[PDB]
């Protein structure tokens, strides 16, 4: 997989600085090599990762990281804490779901009283 990895990471390196060199390369060459550029190709996702990462390296270029031992420890503790929190959210969710299953299983689906006869993902948010 070394080839795929290398091309992904390279086109990711260039794509991280300009985003114009790849959009020109695609039209210039015409090779089924960069087929990962479309969000259709699975690997595309990992691509979006690498680029981001490189984009990140561009963040603090010219800035050094001076984290000390104490600090690193504190940080890892806080990360742990976070993980625990997330775990708790997962638990709660599972619980609520359980309740729902119980009630759904426990209501009269024969108490009918009808009247007539015959995108939500971006909607299930807030703005």
């Amino acid at each position: 997989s070394r080839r795929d990895m290398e091309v992904i990471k390279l086109t990711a390196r260039y794509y991280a600085k300009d985003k114009s060199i790849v959009e020109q390369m695609i039209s210039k060459d015409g090779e089924a090599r960069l087929n990962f550029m479309n969000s259709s190709h699975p690997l595309h996702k990992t691509f979006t990762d690498f680029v981001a990462q490189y984009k990140r390296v561009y963040s603090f270029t010219g800035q050094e990281i001076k984290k000390s031992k104490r600090t690193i420890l504190d940080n890892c503790f806080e990360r742990t804490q976070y993980w625990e929190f997330e775990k708790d959210k997962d638990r709660e969710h599972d619980k609520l779901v359980e309740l729902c299953k119980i009630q759904f299983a426990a209501i009269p689906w024969d108490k009918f009283t009808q009247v007539a006869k015959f995108d939500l993902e971006q909607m299930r948010l807030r703005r």
């Binding site: 997989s1 070394r2 080839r3 990895m5 290398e6 091309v7 990471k9 390279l10 086109t11 390196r13 260039y14 991280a16 600085k17 300009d18 060199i21 790849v22 020109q24 390369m25 210039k28 060459d29 090599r33 990462q53 490189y54 990140r56 390296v57 603090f60 270029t61 010219g62 800035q63 050094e64 990281i65 984290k67 000390s68 031992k69 104490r70 690193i72 420890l73 940080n75 890892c76 503790f77 990360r79 742990t80 804490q81 993980w83 625990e84 929190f85 775990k87 708790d88």
Partner: protein
């Protein structure tokens, strides 16, 4: 070599290590708690968690199983070497931090097309290189592949019990040799050591004359022992920080 890739791999490895020692701090909060408590009495400013958390051995909601001392210490030394690696990488990183060339390299990437091989070993070999239980077939040794040859018994003697006690019998012997008699018992010797808990006693009520040779030599050996024991039993605290603190207090 494109520095971008190197710096990337560096930040990634640092992330991996942080994640490892964080997973550890997660399974057994004591690892941090223990450490932090000691730190509290060296650097007074340090903020420490709610007592309840410490006792119930929990970080948020879940109370984790209590571990035995040998394991806590072990993992603390492992985390120690991890933090060493991290500090190194952070260092090198600090010291390290067009289209025609794109096609130029993409062309050379065609090199050796017939390389039939599966490559799933960059993040997996690292993630694995730093995780719990990385040594045995499945689950036999908590130590990670990173520190697979780490052994506490080569750092602690049996009488120290991984920091539970400090072996002072030996120094009681040397002491008998120093006072040129036998009127001194192990307990009376410890009674002597207590002087050094006071800020003035060891100075104004000395066991022997502080200008005596045998005495000063002994005191040297003993001091060295106590210090090495201290940092040995608390790997997680920055040794250099403590050293410098004490030195500045001295001056």
């Amino acid at each position: 070599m494109n520095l971008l890739e190197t710096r990337r791999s560096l930040l990634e490895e640092m992330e991996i290590i942080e994640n490892a020692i964080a997973e550890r701090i997660q399974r057994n909060p004591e690892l941090y708690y223990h450490y932090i408590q000691e730190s509290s009495k060296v650097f007074p400013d340090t903020k420490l968690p709610r007592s309840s958390l410490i006792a119930e051995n929990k970080i948020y909601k879940f109370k984790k199983v209590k571990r035995k001392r040998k394991q806590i210490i072990l993992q603390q030394h492992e985390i120690n070497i991890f933090l060493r690696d991290y500090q190194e990488k952070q260092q090198t990183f600090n010291k390290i931090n067009f289209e025609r060339k794109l096609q130029q390299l993409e062309k050379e990437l065609k090199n050796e097309d017939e390389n039939f091989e599966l490559d799933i070993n960059s993040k997996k070999d690292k993630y694995a290189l730093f995780s719990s239980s990385s040594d045995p077939s499945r689950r036999t040794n908590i130590l990670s592949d990173r520190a697979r040859d780490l052994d506490l018994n080569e750092i602690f003697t049996r009488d120290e019990q991984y920091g539970e006690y400090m072996e002072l019998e030996q120094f009681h012997s040397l002491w008998l040799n120093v006072i040129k008699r036998g009127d001194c018992s192990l307990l009376q010797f410890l009674d002597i050591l207590e002087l050094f808990l006071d800020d003035e006693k060891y100075l104004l009520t000395p066991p022997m004359d502080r200008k005596n040779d045998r005495y000063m030599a002994f005191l040297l050996k003993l001091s060295k022992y106590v210090e090495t024991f201290f940092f040995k039993s608390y790997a997680l605290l920055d040794a250099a920080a403590v050293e410098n603190l004490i030195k500045s207090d001295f001056e």
